[PDB]
Every structure is written in C-alpha cells, then in structure tokens.
Amino acid sequence: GMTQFKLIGFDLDGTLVNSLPDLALSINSALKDVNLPQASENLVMTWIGNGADVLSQRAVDWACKQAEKELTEDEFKYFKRQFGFYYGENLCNISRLYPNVKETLEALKAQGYILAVVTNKPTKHVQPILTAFGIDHLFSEMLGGQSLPEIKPHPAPFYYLCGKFGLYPKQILFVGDSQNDIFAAHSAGCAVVGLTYGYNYNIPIAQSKPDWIFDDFADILKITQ
Ligand SMILES: [Cl-]
C-alpha cells in the first residue's frame, strides 16, 4: 500500500512458533534412548537454525564429548529416527505461537500482502505445525529444509520467491529471529526485521544489523502501514 512490499516472508521456529520446548523434549528423549546425557534447553537452542541433520549432529557430538562415549553409525541413525518420531508426536504439545502472531498475520493478509514461510525446519513438519496452530490458510508458499537445494543463509530461497511471484528482492520483507535469516536477506537484497525473542546462538540479533529490531511481532504492522 504505502510500502514497496508485495510479499512478507517469515521463519517458523523462533519467529512464529516457540518450538524450543518440544524440540528439547524430543531430542532429550532420543539421547536417553542411546544412553547419552540430556541437554539444557538453552544448549539445545544453540543447535537450532541450520536444519534437523545439523541439529542431530550437534546434539550427539556434545553428548558424546560430555560422556566420553562414541556412537556407531547405526546408533546415530537410530537416534535420528527416534528424535524424528518424538518430535512428530510433540509438534504442538508445549509449543505455542509467539504473542500476537495470528492476529498480525491476519491483519497483513487483510491488507493484501502475499505471505510465505521460509524455514530450515524439515519440510514435512511445516504444513502440519502451521495447521496445528490454525495459520496454514494464510500462507501462499511454505518452504522447508528439503524444499530447495540451498537453504538460509544462502539467498536462493528468496530468489525462488521472486521468481515464483514475479518480484524484485526489494519487494520482499523478511521477518526472522536468527542471523541465518538476516544474512540471507542482506545477501538477496530484501529488507529484514530481526526479532529479539527467538533462537540465535546466544548472539544479540542486533549484531547482524537487521533493518529493524523488534521485541513484539505486532510491531511489523508499524512498518507495513
Ligand atoms: Cl533448524
């Protein structure tokens, strides 16, 4: 309307949904199944951001070092199957939307913005978690960690949106909570909101220099009309 933006994109974990509690519960149950020590929720948080394989590798590497044990490859595969199972079961157990997320997405949709999710979370979990929280109907595109060959912080997912919706990068506003989001946006040429409530390796979101830094998801409305 009075902005340049046609499409607004969002990360999922740490931006729309506070999923850390269910991720931590799931990963710790799987660690227990391979007789490895369990991690604090802050530690688990620091492994999140780069997809479920990297998350799994960080978990097992930490726990093995803690315990002075190693896993065989078959044990590691087993760990990953159990972690996948538990999480699938706990997608919307302790997890909740961040404050004002649904109301804000509805407002933006009402204004005519195309809305998209771009996350490194496995693609298989994206439509289910959005459906569980009653917001799947608002999104015109939902990209996860297996959806394209390169993922955030590579700008490719942003270029895919430009192509699919017929846009210049400058017509996309992105909303994220980690440097993966902010670096991808800077590289593609998209304006980017950094949220301060999400998962960024214990690093302040200001360090990656987003275009805006917000404590409340509803503040996005102040910059979209
Ligand atoms: Cl991730």
mmCIF file of N, CA and C in Angstrom, residues 57-187:
data_model
loop_
_atom_site.group_PDB
_atom_site.id
_atom_site.type_symbol
_atom_site.label_atom_id
_atom_site.label_comp_id
_atom_site.label_asym_id
_atom_site.label_seq_id
_atom_site.Cartn_x
_atom_site.Cartn_y
_atom_site.Cartn_z
ATOM 1 N N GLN A 57 23.482 -33.793 14.606
ATOM 2 C CA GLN A 57 24.926 -33.958 14.700
ATOM 3 C C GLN A 57 25.498 -33.148 15.877
ATOM 4 N N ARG A 58 25.062 -31.907 16.038
ATOM 5 C CA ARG A 58 25.497 -31.110 17.186
ATOM 6 C C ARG A 58 25.113 -31.785 18.505
ATOM 7 N N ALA A 59 23.884 -32.301 18.595
ATOM 8 C CA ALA A 59 23.423 -32.941 19.862
ATOM 9 C C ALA A 59 24.319 -34.092 20.257
ATOM 10 N N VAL A 60 24.527 -35.004 19.307
ATOM 11 C CA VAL A 60 25.229 -36.252 19.573
ATOM 12 C C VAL A 60 26.695 -35.920 19.847
ATOM 13 N N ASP A 61 27.252 -34.956 19.127
ATOM 14 C CA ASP A 61 28.672 -34.600 19.329
ATOM 15 C C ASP A 61 28.935 -34.037 20.722
ATOM 16 N N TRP A 62 28.009 -33.207 21.195
ATOM 17 C CA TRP A 62 28.063 -32.622 22.525
ATOM 18 C C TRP A 62 27.944 -33.702 23.596
ATOM 19 N N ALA A 63 26.936 -34.553 23.445
ATOM 20 C CA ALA A 63 26.622 -35.564 24.457
ATOM 21 C C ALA A 63 27.710 -36.620 24.547
ATOM 22 N N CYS A 64 28.240 -37.019 23.399
ATOM 23 C CA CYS A 64 29.363 -37.964 23.365
ATOM 24 C C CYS A 64 30.611 -37.430 24.049
ATOM 25 N N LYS A 65 30.942 -36.165 23.762
ATOM 26 C CA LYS A 65 32.059 -35.475 24.434
ATOM 27 C C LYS A 65 31.826 -35.377 25.940
ATOM 28 N N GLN A 66 30.622 -34.977 26.337
ATOM 29 C CA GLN A 66 30.244 -34.977 27.748
ATOM 30 C C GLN A 66 30.476 -36.344 28.414
ATOM 31 N N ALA A 67 30.081 -37.423 27.737
ATOM 32 C CA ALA A 67 30.061 -38.763 28.314
ATOM 33 C C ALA A 67 31.322 -39.594 27.993
ATOM 34 N N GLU A 68 32.192 -39.050 27.156
ATOM 35 C CA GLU A 68 33.353 -39.784 26.677
ATOM 36 C C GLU A 68 32.940 -41.119 26.084
ATOM 37 N N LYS A 69 31.903 -41.072 25.248
ATOM 38 C CA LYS A 69 31.418 -42.232 24.512
ATOM 39 C C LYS A 69 31.452 -41.862 23.037
ATOM 40 N N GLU A 70 31.299 -42.846 22.163
ATOM 41 C CA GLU A 70 31.022 -42.589 20.755
ATOM 42 C C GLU A 70 29.788 -43.413 20.398
ATOM 43 N N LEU A 71 29.098 -43.025 19.337
ATOM 44 C CA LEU A 71 28.022 -43.823 18.761
ATOM 45 C C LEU A 71 28.563 -44.431 17.493
ATOM 46 N N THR A 72 28.081 -45.609 17.118
ATOM 47 C CA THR A 72 28.328 -46.157 15.782
ATOM 48 C C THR A 72 27.400 -45.441 14.799
ATOM 49 N N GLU A 73 27.605 -45.621 13.501
ATOM 50 C CA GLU A 73 26.685 -45.015 12.520
ATOM 51 C C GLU A 73 25.252 -45.557 12.690
ATOM 52 N N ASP A 74 25.102 -46.857 12.904
ATOM 53 C CA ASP A 74 23.748 -47.402 13.095
ATOM 54 C C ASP A 74 23.050 -46.827 14.337
ATOM 55 N N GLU A 75 23.809 -46.616 15.420
ATOM 56 C CA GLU A 75 23.262 -45.951 16.606
ATOM 57 C C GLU A 75 22.862 -44.504 16.326
ATOM 58 N N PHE A 76 23.670 -43.789 15.544
ATOM 59 C CA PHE A 76 23.348 -42.439 15.185
ATOM 60 C C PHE A 76 22.089 -42.381 14.315
ATOM 61 N N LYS A 77 22.001 -43.247 13.305
ATOM 62 C CA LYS A 77 20.743 -43.386 12.527
ATOM 63 C C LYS A 77 19.536 -43.654 13.412
ATOM 64 N N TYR A 78 19.693 -44.557 14.385
ATOM 65 C CA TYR A 78 18.641 -44.880 15.359
ATOM 66 C C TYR A 78 18.231 -43.652 16.173
ATOM 67 N N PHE A 79 19.220 -42.946 16.722
ATOM 68 C CA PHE A 79 18.952 -41.706 17.414
ATOM 69 C C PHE A 79 18.086 -40.769 16.569
ATOM 70 N N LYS A 80 18.452 -40.589 15.303
ATOM 71 C CA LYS A 80 17.725 -39.681 14.431
ATOM 72 C C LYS A 80 16.301 -40.123 14.163
ATOM 73 N N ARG A 81 16.078 -41.432 13.993
ATOM 74 C CA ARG A 81 14.714 -41.982 13.822
ATOM 75 C C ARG A 81 13.860 -41.737 15.073
ATOM 76 N N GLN A 82 14.438 -41.940 16.241
ATOM 77 C CA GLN A 82 13.687 -41.725 17.474
ATOM 78 C C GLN A 82 13.384 -40.247 17.695
ATOM 79 N N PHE A 83 14.349 -39.402 17.410
ATOM 80 C CA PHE A 83 14.182 -37.954 17.545
ATOM 81 C C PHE A 83 13.060 -37.467 16.596
ATOM 82 N N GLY A 84 13.109 -37.925 15.354
ATOM 83 C CA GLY A 84 12.038 -37.664 14.368
ATOM 84 C C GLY A 84 10.670 -38.117 14.860
ATOM 85 N N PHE A 85 10.593 -39.354 15.370
ATOM 86 C CA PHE A 85 9.355 -39.842 15.953
ATOM 87 C C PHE A 85 8.811 -38.957 17.089
ATOM 88 N N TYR A 86 9.635 -38.678 18.096
ATOM 89 C CA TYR A 86 9.162 -37.957 19.274
ATOM 90 C C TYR A 86 8.664 -36.583 18.862
ATOM 91 N N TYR A 87 9.415 -35.953 17.974
ATOM 92 C CA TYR A 87 9.089 -34.558 17.587
ATOM 93 C C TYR A 87 7.761 -34.495 16.840
ATOM 94 N N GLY A 88 7.644 -35.348 15.820
ATOM 95 C CA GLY A 88 6.362 -35.596 15.159
ATOM 96 C C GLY A 88 5.209 -35.774 16.137
ATOM 97 N N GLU A 89 5.442 -36.434 17.257
ATOM 98 C CA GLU A 89 4.415 -36.578 18.275
ATOM 99 C C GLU A 89 4.170 -35.304 19.092
ATOM 100 N N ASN A 90 5.203 -34.505 19.258
ATOM 101 C CA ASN A 90 5.175 -33.351 20.138
ATOM 102 C C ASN A 90 5.136 -32.023 19.374
ATOM 103 N N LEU A 91 4.759 -32.012 18.094
ATOM 104 C CA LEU A 91 4.744 -30.777 17.277
ATOM 105 C C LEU A 91 4.014 -29.606 17.926
ATOM 106 N N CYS A 92 2.946 -29.908 18.647
ATOM 107 C CA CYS A 92 2.128 -28.872 19.242
ATOM 108 C C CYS A 92 1.723 -29.303 20.625
ATOM 109 N N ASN A 93 2.704 -29.657 21.431
ATOM 110 C CA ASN A 93 2.464 -30.108 22.777
ATOM 111 C C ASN A 93 2.712 -28.941 23.713
ATOM 112 N N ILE A 94 3.981 -28.622 23.951
ATOM 113 C CA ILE A 94 4.362 -27.476 24.780
ATOM 114 C C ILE A 94 4.548 -26.216 23.935
ATOM 115 N N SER A 95 4.739 -26.408 22.637
ATOM 116 C CA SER A 95 4.908 -25.312 21.697
ATOM 117 C C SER A 95 3.692 -24.386 21.617
ATOM 118 N N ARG A 96 3.961 -23.080 21.509
ATOM 119 C CA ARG A 96 2.925 -22.086 21.339
ATOM 120 C C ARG A 96 3.358 -21.005 20.376
ATOM 121 N N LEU A 97 2.396 -20.317 19.783
ATOM 122 C CA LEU A 97 2.690 -19.147 18.936
ATOM 123 C C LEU A 97 3.260 -18.050 19.786
ATOM 124 N N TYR A 98 4.115 -17.199 19.211
ATOM 125 C CA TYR A 98 4.608 -16.045 19.956
ATOM 126 C C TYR A 98 3.460 -15.019 20.061
ATOM 127 N N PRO A 99 3.562 -14.066 20.973
ATOM 128 C CA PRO A 99 2.461 -13.105 21.195
ATOM 129 C C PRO A 99 2.011 -12.367 19.926
ATOM 130 N N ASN A 100 0.700 -12.329 19.725
ATOM 131 C CA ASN A 100 0.054 -11.606 18.617
ATOM 132 C C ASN A 100 0.349 -12.128 17.217
ATOM 133 N N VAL A 101 0.902 -13.334 17.085
ATOM 134 C CA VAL A 101 1.291 -13.821 15.770
ATOM 135 C C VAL A 101 0.069 -14.003 14.865
ATOM 136 N N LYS A 102 -0.993 -14.630 15.356
ATOM 137 C CA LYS A 102 -2.120 -14.898 14.463
ATOM 138 C C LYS A 102 -2.852 -13.622 14.065
ATOM 139 N N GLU A 103 -3.156 -12.773 15.041
ATOM 140 C CA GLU A 103 -3.791 -11.509 14.780
ATOM 141 C C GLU A 103 -3.034 -10.646 13.757
ATOM 142 N N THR A 104 -1.708 -10.659 13.859
ATOM 143 C CA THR A 104 -0.837 -9.856 12.974
ATOM 144 C C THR A 104 -0.840 -10.434 11.564
ATOM 145 N N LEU A 105 -0.693 -11.751 11.418
ATOM 146 C CA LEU A 105 -0.729 -12.385 10.106
ATOM 147 C C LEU A 105 -2.078 -12.154 9.423
ATOM 148 N N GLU A 106 -3.155 -12.181 10.202
ATOM 149 C CA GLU A 106 -4.496 -11.928 9.640
ATOM 150 C C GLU A 106 -4.617 -10.503 9.132
ATOM 151 N N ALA A 107 -4.067 -9.553 9.887
ATOM 152 C CA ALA A 107 -4.058 -8.144 9.509
ATOM 153 C C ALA A 107 -3.288 -7.915 8.203
ATOM 154 N N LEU A 108 -2.126 -8.536 8.103
ATOM 155 C CA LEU A 108 -1.278 -8.387 6.919
ATOM 156 C C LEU A 108 -1.971 -8.997 5.687
ATOM 157 N N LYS A 109 -2.624 -10.140 5.866
ATOM 158 C CA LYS A 109 -3.366 -10.805 4.781
ATOM 159 C C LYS A 109 -4.514 -9.894 4.339
ATOM 160 N N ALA A 110 -5.223 -9.323 5.303
ATOM 161 C CA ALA A 110 -6.309 -8.375 5.015
ATOM 162 C C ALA A 110 -5.845 -7.162 4.215
ATOM 163 N N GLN A 111 -4.604 -6.738 4.397
ATOM 164 C CA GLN A 111 -4.047 -5.613 3.656
ATOM 165 C C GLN A 111 -3.632 -5.978 2.224
ATOM 166 N N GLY A 112 -3.622 -7.263 1.865
ATOM 167 C CA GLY A 112 -3.247 -7.706 0.514
ATOM 168 C C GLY A 112 -1.844 -8.226 0.328
ATOM 169 N N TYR A 113 -1.084 -8.392 1.405
ATOM 170 C CA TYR A 113 0.251 -8.967 1.273
ATOM 171 C C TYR A 113 0.169 -10.445 1.012
ATOM 172 N N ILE A 114 1.023 -10.923 0.125
ATOM 173 C CA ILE A 114 1.262 -12.333 -0.041
ATOM 174 C C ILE A 114 2.137 -12.745 1.157
ATOM 175 N N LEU A 115 1.828 -13.867 1.816
ATOM 176 C CA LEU A 115 2.600 -14.298 2.992
ATOM 177 C C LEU A 115 3.223 -15.654 2.697
ATOM 178 N N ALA A 116 4.460 -15.828 3.130
ATOM 179 C CA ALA A 116 5.253 -17.028 2.893
ATOM 180 C C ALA A 116 6.062 -17.428 4.110
ATOM 181 N N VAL A 117 6.241 -18.739 4.304
ATOM 182 C CA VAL A 117 7.173 -19.240 5.291
ATOM 183 C C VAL A 117 8.418 -19.808 4.585
ATOM 184 N N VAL A 118 9.602 -19.449 5.101
ATOM 185 C CA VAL A 118 10.858 -19.959 4.604
ATOM 186 C C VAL A 118 11.649 -20.351 5.838
ATOM 187 N N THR A 119 11.771 -21.653 6.043
ATOM 188 C CA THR A 119 12.431 -22.182 7.230
ATOM 189 C C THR A 119 13.389 -23.327 6.859
ATOM 190 N N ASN A 120 14.338 -23.575 7.751
ATOM 191 C CA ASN A 120 15.236 -24.704 7.638
ATOM 192 C C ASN A 120 14.684 -25.941 8.361
ATOM 193 N N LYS A 121 13.580 -25.752 9.083
ATOM 194 C CA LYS A 121 12.847 -26.847 9.675
ATOM 195 C C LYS A 121 12.478 -27.865 8.583
ATOM 196 N N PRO A 122 12.532 -29.186 8.878
ATOM 197 C CA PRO A 122 12.127 -30.121 7.803
ATOM 198 C C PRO A 122 10.797 -29.825 7.158
ATOM 199 N N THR A 123 10.776 -29.928 5.822
ATOM 200 C CA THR A 123 9.601 -29.577 5.037
ATOM 201 C C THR A 123 8.391 -30.355 5.517
ATOM 202 N N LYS A 124 8.592 -31.618 5.862
ATOM 203 C CA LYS A 124 7.467 -32.439 6.310
ATOM 204 C C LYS A 124 6.719 -31.903 7.510
ATOM 205 N N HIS A 125 7.408 -31.170 8.395
ATOM 206 C CA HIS A 125 6.775 -30.592 9.590
ATOM 207 C C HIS A 125 6.106 -29.230 9.357
ATOM 208 N N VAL A 126 6.359 -28.567 8.223
ATOM 209 C CA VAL A 126 5.894 -27.205 8.061
ATOM 210 C C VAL A 126 4.365 -27.070 7.961
ATOM 211 N N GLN A 127 3.734 -27.721 6.995
ATOM 212 C CA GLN A 127 2.298 -27.561 6.913
ATOM 213 C C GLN A 127 1.547 -28.122 8.138
ATOM 214 N N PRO A 128 1.966 -29.286 8.673
ATOM 215 C CA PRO A 128 1.382 -29.778 9.938
ATOM 216 C C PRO A 128 1.453 -28.812 11.127
ATOM 217 N N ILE A 129 2.615 -28.214 11.403
ATOM 218 C CA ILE A 129 2.724 -27.313 12.570
ATOM 219 C C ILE A 129 1.868 -26.059 12.351
ATOM 220 N N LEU A 130 1.862 -25.500 11.135
ATOM 221 C CA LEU A 130 1.014 -24.341 10.802
ATOM 222 C C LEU A 130 -0.504 -24.647 10.895
ATOM 223 N N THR A 131 -0.856 -25.855 10.453
ATOM 224 C CA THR A 131 -2.219 -26.349 10.550
ATOM 225 C C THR A 131 -2.596 -26.514 12.012
ATOM 226 N N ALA A 132 -1.729 -27.132 12.818
ATOM 227 C CA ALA A 132 -1.985 -27.285 14.262
ATOM 228 C C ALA A 132 -2.237 -25.949 14.997
ATOM 229 N N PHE A 133 -1.585 -24.875 14.553
ATOM 230 C CA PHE A 133 -1.775 -23.565 15.154
ATOM 231 C C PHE A 133 -2.793 -22.664 14.411
ATOM 232 N N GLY A 134 -3.490 -23.210 13.420
ATOM 233 C CA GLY A 134 -4.575 -22.505 12.768
ATOM 234 C C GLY A 134 -4.180 -21.358 11.855
ATOM 235 N N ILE A 135 -2.979 -21.406 11.292
ATOM 236 C CA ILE A 135 -2.484 -20.301 10.420
ATOM 237 C C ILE A 135 -2.024 -20.749 9.031
ATOM 238 N N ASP A 136 -2.154 -22.048 8.742
ATOM 239 C CA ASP A 136 -1.756 -22.585 7.421
ATOM 240 C C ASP A 136 -2.505 -21.904 6.275
ATOM 241 N N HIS A 137 -3.763 -21.555 6.485
ATOM 242 C CA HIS A 137 -4.544 -20.934 5.420
ATOM 243 C C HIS A 137 -4.075 -19.538 4.970
ATOM 244 N N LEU A 138 -3.197 -18.916 5.736
ATOM 245 C CA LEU A 138 -2.744 -17.570 5.457
ATOM 246 C C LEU A 138 -1.556 -17.508 4.466
ATOM 247 N N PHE A 139 -0.889 -18.635 4.237
ATOM 248 C CA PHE A 139 0.367 -18.667 3.500
ATOM 249 C C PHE A 139 0.247 -19.186 2.078
ATOM 250 N N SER A 140 0.876 -18.474 1.165
ATOM 251 C CA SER A 140 0.830 -18.792 -0.254
ATOM 252 C C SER A 140 1.989 -19.677 -0.658
ATOM 253 N N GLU A 141 3.018 -19.728 0.168
ATOM 254 C CA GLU A 141 4.156 -20.586 -0.057
ATOM 255 C C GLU A 141 4.729 -20.990 1.309
ATOM 256 N N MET A 142 5.214 -22.226 1.420
ATOM 257 C CA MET A 142 5.793 -22.756 2.677
ATOM 258 C C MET A 142 7.011 -23.557 2.258
ATOM 259 N N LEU A 143 8.198 -23.032 2.511
ATOM 260 C CA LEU A 143 9.428 -23.710 2.123
ATOM 261 C C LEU A 143 10.107 -24.198 3.383
ATOM 262 N N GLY A 144 10.570 -25.449 3.367
ATOM 263 C CA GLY A 144 11.334 -26.025 4.463
ATOM 264 C C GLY A 144 12.687 -26.490 3.988
ATOM 265 N N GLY A 145 13.385 -27.195 4.871
ATOM 266 C CA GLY A 145 14.764 -27.523 4.703
ATOM 267 C C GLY A 145 15.097 -28.460 3.570
ATOM 268 N N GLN A 146 14.099 -29.160 3.044
ATOM 269 C CA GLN A 146 14.291 -30.050 1.896
ATOM 270 C C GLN A 146 13.647 -29.511 0.626
ATOM 271 N N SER A 147 13.118 -28.300 0.665
ATOM 272 C CA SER A 147 12.268 -27.814 -0.421
ATOM 273 C C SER A 147 13.102 -27.367 -1.643
ATOM 274 N N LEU A 148 14.306 -26.892 -1.397
ATOM 275 C CA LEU A 148 15.234 -26.416 -2.411
ATOM 276 C C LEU A 148 16.631 -26.929 -2.060
ATOM 277 N N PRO A 149 17.578 -26.968 -3.040
ATOM 278 C CA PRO A 149 18.974 -27.433 -2.863
ATOM 279 C C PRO A 149 19.834 -26.584 -1.933
ATOM 280 N N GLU A 150 19.601 -25.280 -1.881
ATOM 281 C CA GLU A 150 20.317 -24.407 -0.942
ATOM 282 C C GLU A 150 19.318 -23.708 -0.070
ATOM 283 N N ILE A 151 19.645 -23.627 1.228
ATOM 284 C CA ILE A 151 18.784 -23.035 2.261
ATOM 285 C C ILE A 151 19.496 -21.877 2.976
ATOM 286 N N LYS A 152 18.751 -21.112 3.801
ATOM 287 C CA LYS A 152 19.308 -19.987 4.540
ATOM 288 C C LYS A 152 20.539 -20.486 5.288
ATOM 289 N N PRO A 153 21.619 -19.682 5.353
ATOM 290 C CA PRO A 153 21.762 -18.287 4.954
ATOM 291 C C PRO A 153 22.016 -18.020 3.466
ATOM 292 N N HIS A 154 22.053 -19.051 2.631
ATOM 293 C CA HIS A 154 22.085 -18.825 1.168
ATOM 294 C C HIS A 154 20.791 -18.078 0.752
ATOM 295 N N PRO A 155 20.921 -17.067 -0.147
ATOM 296 C CA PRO A 155 19.738 -16.304 -0.538
ATOM 297 C C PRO A 155 18.795 -17.002 -1.504
ATOM 298 N N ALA A 156 19.160 -18.187 -1.981
ATOM 299 C CA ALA A 156 18.360 -18.922 -3.008
ATOM 300 C C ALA A 156 16.841 -18.989 -2.708
ATOM 301 N N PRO A 157 16.440 -19.338 -1.478
ATOM 302 C CA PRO A 157 15.004 -19.374 -1.171
ATOM 303 C C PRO A 157 14.302 -18.060 -1.467
ATOM 304 N N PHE A 158 14.981 -16.941 -1.204
ATOM 305 C CA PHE A 158 14.424 -15.602 -1.541
ATOM 306 C C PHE A 158 14.330 -15.409 -3.048
ATOM 307 N N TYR A 159 15.302 -15.918 -3.813
ATOM 308 C CA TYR A 159 15.239 -15.795 -5.241
ATOM 309 C C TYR A 159 14.113 -16.642 -5.802
ATOM 310 N N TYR A 160 13.844 -17.761 -5.144
ATOM 311 C CA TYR A 160 12.794 -18.671 -5.591
ATOM 312 C C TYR A 160 11.464 -17.931 -5.484
ATOM 313 N N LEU A 161 11.240 -17.230 -4.358
ATOM 314 C CA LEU A 161 10.024 -16.412 -4.173
ATOM 315 C C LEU A 161 9.874 -15.314 -5.195
ATOM 316 N N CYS A 162 10.987 -14.648 -5.527
ATOM 317 C CA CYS A 162 10.995 -13.625 -6.548
ATOM 318 C C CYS A 162 10.554 -14.176 -7.879
ATOM 319 N N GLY A 163 11.063 -15.346 -8.242
ATOM 320 C CA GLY A 163 10.707 -15.973 -9.470
ATOM 321 C C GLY A 163 9.264 -16.422 -9.532
ATOM 322 N N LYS A 164 8.844 -17.117 -8.488
ATOM 323 C CA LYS A 164 7.501 -17.661 -8.395
ATOM 324 C C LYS A 164 6.443 -16.573 -8.381
ATOM 325 N N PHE A 165 6.671 -15.483 -7.635
ATOM 326 C CA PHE A 165 5.688 -14.407 -7.530
ATOM 327 C C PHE A 165 5.930 -13.180 -8.403
ATOM 328 N N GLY A 166 7.003 -13.202 -9.195
ATOM 329 C CA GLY A 166 7.264 -12.155 -10.178
ATOM 330 C C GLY A 166 7.720 -10.868 -9.505
ATOM 331 N N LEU A 167 8.712 -10.975 -8.628
ATOM 332 C CA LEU A 167 9.114 -9.822 -7.789
ATOM 333 C C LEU A 167 10.593 -9.547 -7.895
ATOM 334 N N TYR A 168 10.975 -8.302 -7.623
ATOM 335 C CA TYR A 168 12.365 -7.979 -7.272
ATOM 336 C C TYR A 168 12.554 -8.256 -5.778
ATOM 337 N N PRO A 169 13.782 -8.685 -5.377
ATOM 338 C CA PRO A 169 14.114 -8.877 -3.982
ATOM 339 C C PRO A 169 13.642 -7.705 -3.105
ATOM 340 N N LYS A 170 13.749 -6.471 -3.601
ATOM 341 C CA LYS A 170 13.367 -5.299 -2.793
ATOM 342 C C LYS A 170 11.864 -5.244 -2.438
ATOM 343 N N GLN A 171 11.053 -6.029 -3.149
ATOM 344 C CA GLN A 171 9.623 -6.108 -2.883
ATOM 345 C C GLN A 171 9.265 -7.160 -1.855
ATOM 346 N N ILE A 172 10.269 -7.808 -1.250
ATOM 347 C CA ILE A 172 10.038 -8.804 -0.198
ATOM 348 C C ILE A 172 10.535 -8.226 1.121
ATOM 349 N N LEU A 173 9.663 -8.241 2.126
ATOM 350 C CA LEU A 173 10.064 -8.016 3.520
ATOM 351 C C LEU A 173 10.197 -9.344 4.204
ATOM 352 N N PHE A 174 11.321 -9.550 4.888
ATOM 353 C CA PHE A 174 11.528 -10.785 5.609
ATOM 354 C C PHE A 174 11.536 -10.535 7.113
ATOM 355 N N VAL A 175 11.006 -11.515 7.852
ATOM 356 C CA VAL A 175 10.904 -11.477 9.324
ATOM 357 C C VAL A 175 11.537 -12.730 9.924
ATOM 358 N N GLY A 176 12.599 -12.543 10.683
ATOM 359 C CA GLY A 176 13.295 -13.651 11.303
ATOM 360 C C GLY A 176 13.815 -13.341 12.682
ATOM 361 N N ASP A 177 14.444 -14.344 13.266
ATOM 362 C CA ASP A 177 14.917 -14.299 14.635
ATOM 363 C C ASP A 177 16.378 -14.753 14.765
ATOM 364 N N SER A 178 17.037 -15.094 13.652
ATOM 365 C CA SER A 178 18.434 -15.510 13.722
ATOM 366 C C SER A 178 19.270 -14.909 12.588
ATOM 367 N N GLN A 179 20.575 -14.921 12.774
ATOM 368 C CA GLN A 179 21.470 -14.418 11.749
ATOM 369 C C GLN A 179 21.342 -15.153 10.424
ATOM 370 N N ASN A 180 20.856 -16.395 10.437
ATOM 371 C CA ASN A 180 20.618 -17.116 9.182
ATOM 372 C C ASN A 180 19.639 -16.326 8.323
ATOM 373 N N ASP A 181 18.597 -15.812 8.975
ATOM 374 C CA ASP A 181 17.533 -15.046 8.308
ATOM 375 C C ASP A 181 18.099 -13.723 7.797
ATOM 376 N N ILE A 182 18.836 -13.046 8.667
ATOM 377 C CA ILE A 182 19.301 -11.676 8.410
ATOM 378 C C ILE A 182 20.365 -11.702 7.291
ATOM 379 N N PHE A 183 21.319 -12.629 7.363
ATOM 380 C CA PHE A 183 22.340 -12.725 6.332
ATOM 381 C C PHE A 183 21.752 -13.082 4.976
ATOM 382 N N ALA A 184 20.804 -14.014 4.941
ATOM 383 C CA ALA A 184 20.135 -14.377 3.668
ATOM 384 C C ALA A 184 19.460 -13.146 3.045
ATOM 385 N N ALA A 185 18.741 -12.378 3.871
ATOM 386 C CA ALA A 185 18.034 -11.182 3.413
ATOM 387 C C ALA A 185 18.981 -10.125 2.883
ATOM 388 N N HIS A 186 20.054 -9.864 3.618
ATOM 389 C CA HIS A 186 21.056 -8.892 3.185
ATOM 390 C C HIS A 186 21.665 -9.307 1.874
ATOM 391 N N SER A 187 21.992 -10.578 1.745
ATOM 392 C CA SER A 187 22.587 -11.066 0.508
ATOM 393 C C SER A 187 21.620 -10.993 -0.703
#
